Design an enzyme around this catalytic site. Structure first.
Site, mmCIF file in Angstrom:
data_model
loop_
_atom_site.group_PDB
_atom_site.id
_atom_site.type_symbol
_atom_site.label_atom_id
_atom_site.label_comp_id
_atom_site.label_asym_id
_atom_site.label_seq_id
_atom_site.Cartn_x
_atom_site.Cartn_y
_atom_site.Cartn_z
ATOM 1 N N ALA C 10 0.861 -1.203 0.000
ATOM 2 C CA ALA C 10 0.000 0.000 0.000
ATOM 3 C C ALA C 10 0.883 1.233 0.000
ATOM 4 O O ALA C 10 1.399 1.656 1.043
ATOM 5 C CB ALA C 10 -0.918 0.025 1.215
ATOM 6 N N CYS C 11 1.013 1.818 -1.185
ATOM 7 C CA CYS C 11 1.582 3.152 -1.350
ATOM 8 C C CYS C 11 0.524 4.053 -1.955
ATOM 9 O O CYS C 11 0.007 3.758 -3.035
ATOM 10 C CB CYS C 11 2.789 3.030 -2.243
ATOM 11 S SG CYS C 11 3.486 4.682 -2.657
ATOM 12 N N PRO C 12 0.244 5.224 -1.346
ATOM 13 C CA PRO C 12 -0.865 6.055 -1.807
ATOM 14 C C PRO C 12 -0.451 7.064 -2.868
ATOM 15 O O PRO C 12 -1.044 8.144 -2.948
ATOM 16 C CB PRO C 12 -1.288 6.775 -0.531
ATOM 17 C CG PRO C 12 0.014 6.956 0.191
ATOM 18 C CD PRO C 12 0.719 5.629 -0.022
ATOM 19 N N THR C 18 2.965 0.186 -5.196
ATOM 20 C CA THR C 18 2.102 -0.911 -4.734
ATOM 21 C C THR C 18 2.341 -2.164 -5.572
ATOM 22 O O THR C 18 2.492 -3.278 -5.028
ATOM 23 C CB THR C 18 0.643 -0.470 -4.845
ATOM 24 O OG1 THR C 18 0.406 0.538 -3.870
ATOM 25 C CG2 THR C 18 -0.330 -1.667 -4.632
#
Ligand SMILES: [Cl-]
Lengths: 104, 104, 104, 104
Positions: C10-12, C18
């Site tokens: 989870a990288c925003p 991601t």
């Protein structure tokens, strides 16, 4: 036995398009019920290269590439070649269309 | 004369976060009326490194980094150090907050 | 029977980190002989979400995340939390270290 | 006065290639002594749009695009159209070549 797809993704800018195209192709192939192996290439090198046996067993080859790669290894296979942008943004349709792709 | 910002962006995965952080910082600095110089560090190397004169003249230093970089060169300057994710997703606030950042 | 690893990446920022972290974890877990399931969270949304049974059966949970996610579903499991950058660049060691991670 | 270049970068995968190509073109144009304005088109939308006056005053228009954009606004200008990958990896040559590009 589910049919097999093999793919190569290759974008010589960093790693993002190479890996996004690969992961979207993997997710969509699995959603449609297929087995999938993906070789990836960037500017530095090549990871998880397709084997001769993997190419032999594949129903289709999908090349999502923004540079020239070696294609002689895919002679006799249906090969669907697209850019990484198209593979990323049109993945469902590309998977489906690959089974009608011309024999290379 | 508008005040000057210098920045370094550095992510050790490909080039995307390095360049997205750089371009977002540049666009938001200009929107807020500041002059901006950004050094980038990514898989292609270090590009457009800050000069001693640029650092001397800057009002603030912004470091958007996910790896170690050379920092002794910023002694005596206000330095606002954040991750590339925060620099990309909170750009407006990071520019504003940098002027209150602690002297390094 | 091979032991099972579950992971969330989870990288925003977009989908790149991601998906890169997910593919790196998938390939390295398999290379080390483990079964692996990865849930991804990125701009496209959440994909391939872990089930309750998958978490129950896992030996370890690897969270390669650059944002908080609710960890309640991983209570009682060993959970190794790292950044996406570290998961991408240090994958072999992170998989090995996860088996010594603290129980959450 | 330094001659003026205008450019548009447009990759419809997130913002990364759009911003990497924009920064490469901006830095290389400046290195070669040109004035440069870059409009970007990515998932965030269009930023720093070229004005009619900027296009009027430009010596050349460089389009680094991986999708079709309306080109009516560039009529009468030399327009050099390349992919974002080529703009990113061949920037020095592309800027030099643009001055011999066909009038659109
Ligand atoms: Cl990248």
């Amino acid at each position: 036995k589910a049919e097999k797809i093999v793919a190569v993704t290759a974008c010589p800018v960093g790693v993002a398009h190479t890996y996004i195209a690969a992961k979207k192709i993997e997710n969509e192939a699995k959603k449609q019920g297929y087995s999938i192996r993906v070789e990836t290439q960037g500017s530095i090198g090549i990871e998880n290269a397709l084997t001769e046996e993997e190419i032999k067993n594949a129903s289709v080859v999908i090349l999502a590439v923004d540079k020239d790669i070696d294609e002689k290894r895919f002679e006799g296979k249906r090969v669907y070649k697209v850019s990484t942008v198209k593979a990323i943004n049109n993945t469902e349709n590309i998977i489906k269309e690959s089974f009608n792709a011309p024999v290379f």
